[PDB]
Nucleic acid binder design. Sequence first.
RNA 1: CAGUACGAAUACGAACCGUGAAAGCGUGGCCUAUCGAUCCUUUAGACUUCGGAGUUUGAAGCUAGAGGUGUCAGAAAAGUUA
RNA 2: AACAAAGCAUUGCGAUGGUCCUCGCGGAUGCUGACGCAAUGUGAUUUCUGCCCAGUGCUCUGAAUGUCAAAGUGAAGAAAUU
RNA 3: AGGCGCCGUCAACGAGUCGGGUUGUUUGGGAAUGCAGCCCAAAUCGGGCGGUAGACUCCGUCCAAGGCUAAAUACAGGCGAG
Lengths: 255, 194, 77, 105, 144
Amino acid sequence: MGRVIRAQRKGAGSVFKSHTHHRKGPARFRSLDFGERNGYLKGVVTDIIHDPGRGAPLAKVTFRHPFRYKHQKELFVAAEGMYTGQFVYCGRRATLSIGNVLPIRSVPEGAVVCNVEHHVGDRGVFARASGDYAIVISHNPDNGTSRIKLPSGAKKIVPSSCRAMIGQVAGGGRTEKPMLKAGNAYHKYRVKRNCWPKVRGVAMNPVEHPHGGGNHQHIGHASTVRRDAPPGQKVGLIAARRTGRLRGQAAATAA
Amino acid sequence: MGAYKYVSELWRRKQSDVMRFVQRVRCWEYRQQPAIVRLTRPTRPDKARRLGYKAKQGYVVYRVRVRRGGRKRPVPKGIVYGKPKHQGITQLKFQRNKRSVAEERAGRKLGGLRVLNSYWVNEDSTYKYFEIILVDVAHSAIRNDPRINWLCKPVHKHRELRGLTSAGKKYRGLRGKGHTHHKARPSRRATWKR
Amino acid sequence: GTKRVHFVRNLIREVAGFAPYEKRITELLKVGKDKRALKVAKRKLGTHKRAKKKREEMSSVLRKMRSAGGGAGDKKK
Amino acid sequence: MVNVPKTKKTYCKNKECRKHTLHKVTQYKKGKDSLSAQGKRRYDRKQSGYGGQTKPVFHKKAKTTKKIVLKLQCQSCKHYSQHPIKRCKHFEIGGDKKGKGTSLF
Amino acid sequence: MTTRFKKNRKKRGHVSAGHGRIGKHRKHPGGRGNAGGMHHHRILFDKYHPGYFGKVGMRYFHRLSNRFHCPAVNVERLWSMVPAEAGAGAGKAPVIDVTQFGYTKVLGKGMLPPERPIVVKAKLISKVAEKKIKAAGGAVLLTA
RNA sequence: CAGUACGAAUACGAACCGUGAAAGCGUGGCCUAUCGAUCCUUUAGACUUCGGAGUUUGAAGCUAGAGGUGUCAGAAAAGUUA
RNA sequence: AACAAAGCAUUGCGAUGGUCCUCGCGGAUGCUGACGCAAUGUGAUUUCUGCCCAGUGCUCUGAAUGUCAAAGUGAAGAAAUU
RNA sequence: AGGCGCCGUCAACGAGUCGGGUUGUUUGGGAAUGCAGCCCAAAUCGGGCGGUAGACUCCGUCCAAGGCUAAAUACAGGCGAG
């Protein structure tokens, strides 16, 4: 049989983890007391600070409104075009301006949003990463459902009460340009949850992977491996729909 | 005899009449309350009155919550190492019963007290519930009662653990006497395998 | 008149008597629960069927608490 | 393969005739079941899911070759006999008929 | 040669029945049955030993027949009769006596060789279809 | 096989038939002889048996034949290591 | 000359993510969100990357037909056993 | 209060228990040891047992799901001695 394949090493352990202490703080969207046509939540962006845990920026927002419990703060997710000294509005009668957060119901159809909730008050799930955005296609006055298209193209049915932020996430185009030092890849790995560099399965000797062994390097068996297959076996193309470059489309996806 | 017969008659019928309603309703409580619950009332006074209940100081009654299922055996995903007559993980089920585990848990937390006996107070779909009588040894009222001072004797400390409970006698096969009973009495380790 | 035809407490009592006579005989062929199906099934199947289905539920039983306590009382005189 | 008549005359083994009478030939299998046998020793002795010595069902097996494979059942008394060893294969039957001689056609 | 497990021979008494050969009684089933319960014992003695110990058996009374020739209940002449279910008289070798033997079973060629004037006597338990009809009477003896 | 099993032969007797004139021949194949234990299962025949009596159901079993073993006097069974 | 590497492809993943550790709690995923995370193939640039879905792998739809377990359910039936 | 005799008579008699199935473990324990786990589930002159299952009178024994309890046994021996 074998010594454990790296995929089990994910598992638990100090080596597989991110530097979670290092991450900058929780960036959850403030669950509104109530009302909010301008300023029972008014923010000023004061600063824009990088998030190591995702590599795109946050905007530092204060947020100052009262009560007790009152709760306010802090570093909310940046959208494109957010600047120091711009106003942020968070809630139901917030102005429809980029950087403001409000429930989907309040948003006009055809407006790009980010930090969209799965479930109301979870504060925001979908459209997060750099330069991505969901697109709110349908509402109507929809008591029942607000239809949003996520960046993959899947059309998601969400409760109209789910809040989102208008605009697309900052940092777009990050993906376009090539890393162009091994060392650039290296530090970028250090920050995230990953064991790098990666040795190819074929490169190893048999004990380390299903791919390993053989004088010349090659996968002894067919690469694409079972949904049924157990952990340790399941490597390569897991249960692949198709392979090789030709004749597909993006995901389509029914409701 | 008395009133104690009716509740005893009810508790047969866990599934039926007032008892499925009232005890399924007390499980809203039982799921909420911990795996130690001390209470000041027996749920069954009948089967308290027939496992040893006198209201008298040093007496406590306590509910214990024990998982349903068997036992699952270390290590999975670094598995034995041995020939397959001895490989077994969920396949084996403990040969202590779920009632005795509850006796152990209870006597561990209430360490200055000794389990007298125990009874059944239901199950839902993952928990099995027991209520257990533990009786102080150390206080005068137990000592100056000749129906319950037999517990006090130093030989009787930690009796649940050494299997001298009623439950501990029953899983040890000591329910019979005669024919059969021949591998249980006086002990499951008894002849030393001579 | 109807139900059953006819009589009432004695008819409850016949049925209440038929039910241990049906039950003791299931118990003398074990289980209970499959024999309670078989002992009923291997027979004509109407009055007994409804009467059996209620005993395999939930059931009677305030009335059961009422009758058993009188029978216990009256076998304790 | 064999012409064997389904209907033959033979001696009885059995003690109610203990003389010669008409007999009917048939190839036989049933198996059992209701479980008291090896089948029980296995049900119990699974014992970590081990079929174990319930397999001598394999080797992958194959050589082919028999003995006559019969029970000849009396049509006039119900007492009737199986026959002793000599070497066949395979075996044909139907109601026979016949390896008929003679042919002009 | 030795390590006493290379010339020895072998270790445990096997290769002996299967494939090498001689010895035990070997290859078994075969009858098996009855259990440890409804089981033995029937005590059995041939009538020639009561004829040894007729003359010296002077705790058994002589009676209608001459002084050598004794009524003797064989149940109270058989050692280990009390833990046995019944005491039976077996018929080997002569009797040259005019005895009266009481038994819980007797052979047919156990009466017949001491036909030589005898009274062969069933005890009540010889039947054993005799009336323990709740009632009272007869019994089996007890001793170490 | 010089004493060791299954097999095989070479004959009988007992029962039971044929053909045949019958004496006889006929205990598988011109002769020189042409295969399988052990659990289990299968059935055959009759009978035996399963723990108060009583009664049905099956079981347990004797004796005999057929179902795998050609590693053929009987394992349930693929390779590499540089 | 081996491994890594940046670069190039397939595939799984809609979140309580799939995946790893764990009986479990929980954790690692991720206090992240498909411009993201895993699982793999190959290995700068430059020009390119043909034909084959028969076998093996894997995946798709199956409201319909031959096979396809258990239970509950029906038949003989005192059961059970078929 | 206790005993004996006579007199009727009877209640401290313990439920997810007895019991059956599904899946296991263990045992000499076999349809028949003991225990675990999932599902189901009685009666209360009624019930339980007698080495597979089902009518009767019974025969024969015994009242679970409760308890305690001296003495006799062990001590590859702390501690004293032969």
